[PDB]
Write a protein that binds this ligand. Structure first.
Ligand code: A1BYY
Lengths: 336, 390
């Protein structure tokens, strides 16, 4: 089909970001993923004429036989066009918080199906590094709608609505929200009925897609009503901040708010598994939970204030990350 | 033979038509001869009056040689060509990574002139050489290959190198290839005969892709002395007012890598330099072990080794200039710094042997307000106690 025209913010050049070093196994997994993608024709190599760069690294979802590639399109997301207020997409439903059950699903392959504009493909280049600075890394660029980029849901809106009409027409109370790859299905019924409906939607999507991934079928459940209820108001224009702090015996306390000294949300978290001995693992799990909670409650993933050293966090945040996207974080080095 | 890389100029910008002025007669004759030889070799081509672009050209007398080299001022064009892919890469670690039994070197000097240039960008390389006394118009030429001194020649050459050598590395993952200056260094673990056949195969491959490597064996000695590091197939060694202090500090810092013991401190430096040392290379099968020593007054010395008495590396860590710094905090900064360095150099973070009690770190985490990364470690009885007291 004909491609969709996209542009940039006028007066803004493409993204160029340094790529941090990675371990051996992560590089092997990234090479395997990228070779498979290039075999499928969704990723193409580029020469040196493209001066734009973007980090890439491998994460591991629960029960993964192979790692999953993840790209840090934060710089591009900041620097790409104002394509999501005129083409806003769909306003976030306000029903997500009151229901008892909400299940996440992955729809990244549908994004990978549809092609991207040609004159933008230069800006989505990434580089897989090499160990010991032995050779320059391997450079790649996307030929279809990429993951973790907010332009993909905005472009896919039409096809997503075309396939989501029957299910929504079945019963108006069960709602569906989209955020990047995440697809949230919200219901206030029993667990068995919710799971059956979720499976029904899963093979609904499979039947629509002519092209059964174990990673696609995996999802987790969240219970908003289990949370404390105790914000007075919320301003969509302003960007919100969430601060993390460490409490003794592996505890963590997080505060979400747009303005200081007025807590929109407060929470505590802890998990005494025994693999918690790594502080970075507990911090990563806490930050993912907080960001998912805000995404269910509000439209966008927030800004974060991390109580950790810059280099330690930078080195040891990748392997414990499990989400499909990356928020924006800032480091704090002054005790309270 | 290789496919050309498309390249354009910065938008809103036009080709160089900068004026040039007449030169000497012998220099112009040398330039004419060089241009004729390039035209015979195909590196240059003739262009008619339809191209108005012009760039300066001048000859530089080669040191102790009759011939003069042609150099073209590309300072004006370097602002016309688009940005290229620049990589901020640090110098590779002093050969700590891996080992190869046999090593050969080859020459790739002519390769810089064997890479074809884009068709759209050729007409911008126009330079004129006026005739003597300028009674008639001079000779105008443009390059069909990569020109020396151009902004984008190194990046294009590097990409071409990588794309040429990707299949050869694919077929032989054991053999390592690097390019230092005009010398291509190849290292292999195989036997002499197998390595020779592989080198001849590589030479034929590079000839097929057009890059030139001489048949004659290079005269480079086994000690390569690259980047101040004397390199040997089995070991490696370091190089044997207001400004004088910085020079001495710099020369002392470099000697601390393999000549362990670098700290009236001139006498100890002279004494430790008199003792020859060596360093073995990393082995992937065996795991890495890093050991820490508390030298005192905010100084630590770390040794990375596979097996005892065979150090892979040695280094020193110094505390950051602040009001107060706790001993365990310096220890943790040191260990995480060594872990990051090992990740960069080898790719796997190493296990540590520290002279600290296990409960000390647990108490530290219970008391610390930040989040720190702690690997599994084995305590080793060493005279330094570093108990941290209270
Ligand atoms: N001039 C000059 C030096 C040429 C050189 C070669 C390789 C390099 C690599 S490397 O990746 O190719 N490499 N190196 C070794 N160690 C090793 C062992 C024995 C010998 C001998 N004789 C040598 Cl020269 C090197 N092991 C791996 N894998 C990386 C980075 C930088 C390099 C510079």
């Amino acid at each position: 089909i004909e491609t969709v025209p996209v542009k940039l913010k006028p007066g803004m050049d493409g993204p160029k970001v340094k790529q941090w070093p990675l371990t051996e196994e992560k590089i092997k997994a990234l090479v395997e993923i990228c070779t498979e993608m290039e075999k499928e024709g969704k990723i193409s190599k580029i020469g040196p004429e493209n001066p734009y760069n973007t980090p890439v690294f491998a994460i591991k979802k629960k029960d993964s036989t192979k790692w999953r590639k993840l790209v840090d399109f934060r710089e591009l997301n900041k620097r790409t066009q104002d394509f999501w207020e005129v083409q806003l997409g769909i306003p976030h439903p306000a029903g997500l918080k009151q229901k008892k059950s909400v299940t996440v699903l992955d729809v990244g392959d549908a994004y990978f199906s549809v092609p991207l504009d040609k004159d933008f493909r230069k800006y989505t280049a990434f580089t897989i590094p090499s160990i010991n600075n032995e050779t320059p890394g391997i450079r790649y660029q996307y030929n279809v709608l990429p993951q973790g980029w907010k332009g993909s849901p905005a472009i896919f809106q039409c096809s997503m609505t075309k396939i989501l009409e029957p299910f929504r027409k079945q019963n108006p109370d069960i709602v569906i929200y989209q955020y990047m790859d995440d697809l949230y299905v919200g219901s206030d019924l029993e667990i068995g009925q919710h799971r059956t409906k979720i499976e029904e939607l899963r093979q609904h999507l499979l039947r629509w897609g002519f092209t059964e991934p174990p990673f696609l079928w995996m999802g987790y459940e969240l219970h908003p009503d289990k949370w404390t209820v105790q914000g007075v108001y919320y301003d969509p224009s302003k960007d919100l901040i969430a601060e993390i702090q460490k409490q003794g015996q592996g505890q963590w306390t997080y505060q979400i708010y747009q303005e200081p000294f007025k807590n929109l949300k407060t929470g505590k978290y802890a998990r005494m598994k025994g693999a918690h001995t790594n502080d970075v693992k507990q911090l990563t799990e806490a930050v993912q939970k907080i960001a998912t909670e805000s995404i269910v409650i509000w439209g966008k993933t927030p800004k974060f204030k991390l109580p950790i050293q810059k280099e330690t966090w930078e080195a040891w945040w990748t392997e414990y990350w499990q989400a499909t996207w990356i928020p924006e974080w800032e480091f704090v080095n002054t005790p309270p | 033979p290789i496919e050309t890389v498309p390249v354009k100029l910065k938008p809103g910008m036009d080709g160089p038509k900068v004026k040039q002025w007449p030169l000497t007669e012998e220099k112009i004759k040398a330039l004419v001869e060089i241009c004729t030889e390039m035209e015979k070799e195909g590196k240059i081509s003739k262009i008619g009056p339809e191209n108005p672009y012009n760039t300066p050209v001048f000859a530089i007398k080669k040191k102790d040689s009759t011939k003069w080299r042609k150099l073209v001022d590309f300072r004006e064009l370097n602002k016309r060509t688009q940005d290229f892919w620049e990589v901020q890469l640090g110098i590779p670690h002093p050969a700590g990574l891996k080992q190869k039994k046999s090593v050969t070197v080859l020459d790739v000097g002519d390769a810089y002139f064997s890479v074809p240039l884009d068709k759209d960008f050729r007409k911008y390389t126009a330079f004129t050489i006026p005739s003597i006394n300028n009674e008639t118009p001079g000779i105008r030429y443009q390059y069909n290959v990569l020109p020396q001194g151009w902004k984008g020649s190194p990046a294009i050459f590097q990409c071409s190198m990588t794309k040429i050598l990707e299949p050869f590395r694919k077929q032989n993952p054991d053999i390592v290839i690097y390019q230092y200056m005009d010398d291509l260094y190849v290292g292999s673990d195989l036997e002499i005969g197998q390595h020779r056949t592989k080198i001849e195969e590589l030479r034929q491959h590079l000839l097929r892709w057009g890059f030139t490597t001489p048949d004659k064996k290079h005269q480079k000695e086994p000690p390569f002395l690259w980047m101040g590091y004397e390199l040997h197939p089995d070991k490696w060694t370091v190089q044997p007012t207001v400004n004088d202090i910085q020079k001495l500090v710099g020369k002392l810092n470099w000697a601390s890598q393999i000549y362990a013991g670098i700290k009236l401190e001139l006498a100890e430096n002279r004494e430790i330099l008199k003792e020859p040392v060596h360093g073995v290379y990393y082995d992937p099968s065996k795991d890495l072990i890093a050991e820490i020593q508390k030298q005192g007054q905010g100084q630590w010395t770390y040794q990375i080794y596979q097996e005892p008495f065979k150090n892979l590396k040695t280094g020193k860590y110094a505390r950051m200039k602040g009001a107060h710094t706790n001993d365990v905090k310096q220890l943790t900064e040191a260990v995480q710094k060594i872990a990051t360095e090992s990740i960069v150099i080898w790719g796997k973070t190493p296990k540590f042997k520290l002279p600290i009690q296990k409960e000390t770190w647990e108490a530290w985490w219970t008391e610390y307000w930040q989040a720190t990364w702690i690997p599994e470690w084995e305590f080793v009885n060493t005279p330094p106690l570093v108990k941290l007291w209270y």
